[PDB]
């Protein structure tokens, strides 16, 4: 099942991302259930917003919000919920929400899957519009959900993203 | 796997529905295989009709047709086949088909997933058009499939829906 | 052409709405060109937001922003850009943007097209979630477009919507 | 505009069909307005049914229902509302509805557009399932619209379809 | 999981096909992972081409390319990735790629799922256009992927397809 | 109508492109009819290929193939057939087909519509993958259409694209 997918072939540079929400999809917030490995509806989002990239997590990790670390994966075409993509981290949006510190990694499809994103080496190679759109999404998508909120801290580089991946892998290993 | 999903957090008021067919989808009748938990094609429907709501079942139940009890789930956006949604029963369309008594529960997304359907407390709060469309669908969707047929009995309330859920849970428990 | 469509069969209660942007569509802001009647791309929106209803205008009207008065039309299924729907006004979101006062009418499909929205007689019959989502959209969709902005004033009733329709028809008549 | 499209290059064998409703689309019944040439919503259909083929009309014709003669066009991929396709008639479903005699021609894409349908020479070359699905659609799609109804008479051949095209062209010519 | 699905109810005439890629989908080459049973992205295809039919494999088989034998399944509507369809083989496109001999079976939905394809008894009953399109796809879809290539050998009949199914089942059984 | 749209606000740097075929669409080759301004189906393409960008033309121009000069427009989301987008030329794929010399301009959305493509100043700023995909499409999409063919000459810069625009505008002006 999806429960058994590795964190990656060679963390933190070579990871697998389990996709929960496709890019430019309807505002249904799916989450994989850790007991069954099935995709559950967590929420029907209240704002008229969509995830700007495919969205999911790295298996066998844990953020301080109590769930595996979150990842945004840009692709040329939207991915299937429940599918897995091999990726390379390139940056991170540091942020906190009501459940705890809750960074959003950005990881691009691995070179073996496409050459498309090879030119994206670090956070400044991501389009500025995309980074602005991602930060705006996380700042506002909970605006009509009472008691849910976000504080965006800022964009950091690939090295910061890789440190976040290591920390989150250790957290899962360790409790 | 989907085979392991509970019937619900607190049956019969708080249930989980495994989705097989999205709302306003192509006429492919998928069914979860009980041995493997995979989605199989049961039929390519012959009529030019679509399921009026997302369609699926409550795990760990059994109707007299030999399959888990059936559920229609209205949502603002179609659900993914194989996904699970927490719901609250609000009514039932009693009917029989060639395989046996085969009620169609209507359950709305639980308040925790959205406030959208909180105002739907009982069957008379469902839109009349929707209930008419559901009954018409089940009356006609087998019209071009020889030896398959339906007899619709009528709409009943939330309390009837909850009794159906209990009965179907017991049937699975019991044989 | 679309240039020749009446404002309505019986303004202000019975109107036609020319659709520019479908509900739950990609963020491409189309506008009908008044010289040619063709649909032009005005903008690729920068935020990850979508119009919560079909969006367009009443022909042969003018708002203070210099364009025909704007309308949101809820429907069960998204409409085609460039299509026309007969509608009945039920409420208005008063607001201003960088181009001038720029109210957003809400008009539902006319009874002749469907009975679905007959129960929506006035603004308080619109779902609260929908009204919240519409106001949030207009408050934020220009957040990443420099020099574009909105000030939302508030929701008003059907009678206010009808007065806005009359005023906007007169403005076009008159200059 | 669409108002100016010929009935065909060489009626009745070589026709143009103006498309109003795509195949396997949402149940929005669009109709071209004869004054403006714009696509108007005639109805949001009440049944959970979809047109089994692209649906539209031959310009410069008239059926006894007061509108141009109706055509179903099978294609490998759905057509755009408001687009025009060159076709060849292969059969007709004779029927009446509340507005008058109202045959449904079946015309396939002309050989110049594709070789796909060349093998369809006459009505018996259409798939039986498709013909059954079309007849079932027209028998039932008005089932929840009070005062709207259909009586299906039966399938007839290409020669009957061509006679219907001639008759309908003459009717428009003549009153 | 999908790992546990039989090759078929009665190989080689009555098989199950696990679907990885829907018909007329975006060019994302998904493959089921044999360890986890999850759908992984193998590649984002570089050419502007799409699989002409649903595409997948027969479980518990092995081709000389090291993966389960490949199958194309025509259907009236695209299938879900990860779903299973009961099918009947009707022909095979013999070909080799960089990974080894790599035939492409064509199998149609079993009569129990639909009567639509009953008339397809053998390879010459498949539309010529479809067979041409399939061969052209496999000849060209790797044209922009360095070191990936195909040599198409030619179309063969149902009996050849069934022999391929038997051989591939034995290969898996046997090493 | 679309017949009346200018070639551009300031040719050759500031153009309007009438869209006939959306990006990543079904293989239906639409063309605007010069007499009526309606979208006609020219062909159902025989290969399993899709246009890699939105595709259309500059009004009031003529290529040697007898039709207005062709344009590919990359966008973040596919455009509507029959819509118009303001664009800036950045490069050209020189090629010939059976109808004559038939260059394919590449023009990006104008800065006024989005800042997304501002960084694309000339042909070498287009992604290499995209340019490879476009050339491969035009080399192969007619492979199964007898008597239709293409010879691709090669990619040239923005200045070459602008000269092509001027030449094609003059050709229309002049005969
Ligand atoms: Cl791991
Ligand atoms: Cl979050
Ligand atoms: Cl930012
Ligand atoms: Cl349980
Ligand atoms: Cl049933
Ligand atoms: Cl009813
Ligand atoms: Cl008027
Ligand atoms: Cl606005
Ligand atoms: Cl509000
Ligand atoms: Cl004519
Ligand atoms: Cl009718
Ligand atoms: Cl029939
Ligand atoms: Cl087996
Ligand atoms: Cl292959
Ligand atoms: Cl072939
Ligand atoms: Cl001009
Ligand atoms: Cl060409
Ligand atoms: Cl190239
Ligand atoms: Mn969307
Ligand atoms: Mn969560
Ligand atoms: Mn998460
Ligand atoms: Mn969070
Ligand atoms: Mn999180
Ligand atoms: Mn069943
Ligand atoms: Mn069931
Ligand atoms: Mn049943
Ligand atoms: Mn049942
Ligand atoms: Mn404007
Ligand atoms: Mn407007
Ligand atoms: Mn405005
Ligand atoms: Mn306005
Ligand atoms: Mn549909
Ligand atoms: Mn009519
Ligand atoms: Mn008609
Ligand atoms: Mn009629
Ligand atoms: Mn008619
Ligand atoms: Mn496609
Ligand atoms: Mn492979
Ligand atoms: Mn394979
Ligand atoms: Mn291969
Ligand atoms: Mn293979
Ligand atoms: Mn042409
Ligand atoms: Mn052209
Ligand atoms: Mn050409
Ligand atoms: Mn050309
Ligand atoms: Na979407
Ligand atoms: Na909140
Ligand atoms: Na649908
Ligand atoms: Na039947
Ligand atoms: Na959408
Ligand atoms: Na702004
Ligand atoms: Na559809
Ligand atoms: Na009726
Ligand atoms: Na597609
Ligand atoms: Na290659
Ligand atoms: Na597509
Ligand atoms: Na050719």
From Swiss-Prot, chains A, B, C, D, E, F:
Q: Does the keyword Magnesium apply?
A: yes
Q: Which GO terms describe its biological process?
A: phosphate-containing compound metabolic process
Keyword Manganese in annotation: no
**Positions with a binding annotation for substrate:** 29, 43, 55, 141
Q: Which residues are noted in the entry as Mg(2+) 1-binding? A: 65, 70, 102
EC assignment? 3.6.1.1
Which terms are listed as keywords in the entry?
Answer: Cytoplasm, Hydrolase, Magnesium, Metal-binding
What GO cellular component entries does it have?
cytosol; membrane
Short name of any one Pfam family annotated for the protein: Pyrophosphatase
Reaction catalysed by this enzyme: diphosphate + H2O = 2 phosphate + H(+)
InterPro entries linked to this entry: Pyrophosphatase, Pyrophosphatase_sf
Q: Which cofactor does it need?
A: Mg(2+)
Q: Where in the cell is it found?
A: Cytoplasm
Cite the binding residues for Mg(2+) 2.
70
Its main subcellular localisation, reduced to a broad class, is cytoplasm
Q: Which HAMAP family match?
A: Inorganic_PPase
Listed under subunit, the entry gives: Homohexamer.
**PANTHER family in alphabetical order:** INORGANIC PYROPHOSPHATASE
Entries under NCBIfam families matching the protein: PRK01250.1
Family, similarity comment: Belongs to the PPase family.
Q: Would you tell me the protein name for this molecule?
A: Inorganic pyrophosphatase
Source organism of the structure: Escherichia coli (strain K12)
Give the encoding gene's name: ppa
């Amino acid at each position: 099942s999806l429960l058994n997918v590795p964190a990656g072939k060679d963390l933190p540079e070579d990871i697998y991302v389990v996709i929960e929400i496709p890019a430019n999809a309807d505002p249904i917030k799916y989450e994989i259930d850790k007991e069954s490995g099935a995709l559950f509806v967590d929420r029907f989002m209240s704002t008229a917003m969509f995830y700007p990239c495919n969205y999911g997590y790295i298996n066998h990790t844990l953020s301080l919000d109590g769930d595996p670390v979150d990842v945004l994966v840009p692709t040329p075409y939207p991915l299937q919920p429940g599918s897995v993509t091999r990726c390379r981290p390139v940056g991170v949006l540091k942020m906190t929400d009501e459940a705890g510190e809750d960074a959003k990694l950005v990881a691009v499809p691995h070179s073996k899957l496409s050459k498309e994103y090879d030119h994206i080496k670090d956070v400044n190679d991501l389009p500025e519009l995309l980074k602005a759109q991602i930060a705006h999404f996380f700042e506002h998508y909970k605006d009509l959900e009472k008691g849910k909120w976000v504080k965006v801290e800022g964009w950091e580089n690939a090295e910061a993203a890789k440190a976040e991946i290591v920390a989150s892998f250790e957290r899962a290993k360790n409790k």
